[PDB]
Chain A
Amino acid sequence: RIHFGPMGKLAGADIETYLLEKARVISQQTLERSYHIFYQLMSGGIEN
């Protein structure tokens, strides 16, 4: 839900969420990947 002000310009946004695949985290079926955030943290993260 995108929100707009009195005169013209933007005021904010209300976003809900329906489901998530929490089931997959154990073993995914074929050629899928698990949640993107992971791979990112693995490769980009420094030695520290």
Chain B
Amino acid sequence: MADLKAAEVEKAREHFEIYDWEGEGKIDARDLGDLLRSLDCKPTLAMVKKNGGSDKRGEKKLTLEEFLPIFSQIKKEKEVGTLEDFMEGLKVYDKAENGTMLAAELAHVLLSLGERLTDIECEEIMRVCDEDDDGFLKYEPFVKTIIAGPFPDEGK
């Protein structure tokens, strides 16, 4: 079987107690999304709603007694992703064996199919880049910074 360890119970308690904005001890079904995400399990919104979650706000409230039989189900998933799938994937763009990627062509793929990102998030994803014209990013430093997160060594 599987059940939650003293350390894990503390991780789950901390985050839940933060999410109590009301003063009653409860989470929204929408907020189930980013709560698990901060808990470090990476899901689709499909994974969130699968365990009783909402698009809308103001639908159902879940206690910690409800939330823990959500989290202890969630832990079973195996297909999270690696680096190398993404390399293989993002290599497909090529035409001449350069590993280089033009800015428009790269915003568009982020926008269009999937759970999707907005116009706004693309303006943010561009923000770190500076001073390269007509107008090329590169597949390898890109992916590695995504997996490294917001503060690798530098961080702004």
Contact = CB atoms under 8 A, between A and B. Distances in A.
Interface of A: 6-8
Given A6-B103, A6-B135, 7 more contacts: A6-B134, A7-B103, A7-B104, A7-B107, A7-B126, A8-B104, A8-B107
Taking chain B's interface residues, is the majority helix, strand, or loop, or is none over half, making it mixed? helix
Interface residues on B, range: under 10
9 contacts: A6-B103, A6-B134, A6-B135, A7-B103, A7-B104, A7-B107, A7-B126, A8-B104, A8-B107
A5 B35 CA distance: 40
A7 B126 CA distance: 11
Interface in B7-24: none
Interface string B123-135: 0001000000011
Contacts of B135: 6
Nearest to A8: B104
Q: Which 8 pairs from chain A and chain B are nearest by CB?
A: A7-B104, A7-B103, A6-B135, A8-B104, A7-B107, A8-B107, A6-B103, A6-B134
Contacts of B103: 6-7
Interface string B100-133: 0001100100000000000000000010000000
A4 to B, nearest CB: 10
Contacts of B104: 7-8
Contacts of A6: 103, 134-135
A6 B135 CA distance: 9
A27 B103 CA distance: 58
A7 B104 CA distance: 6
Contacts of A7: 103-104, 107, 126
Contacts of B107: 7-8
A8 B107 CA distance: 10
B106 to A, nearest CB: 10
A6 B126 CA distance: 13
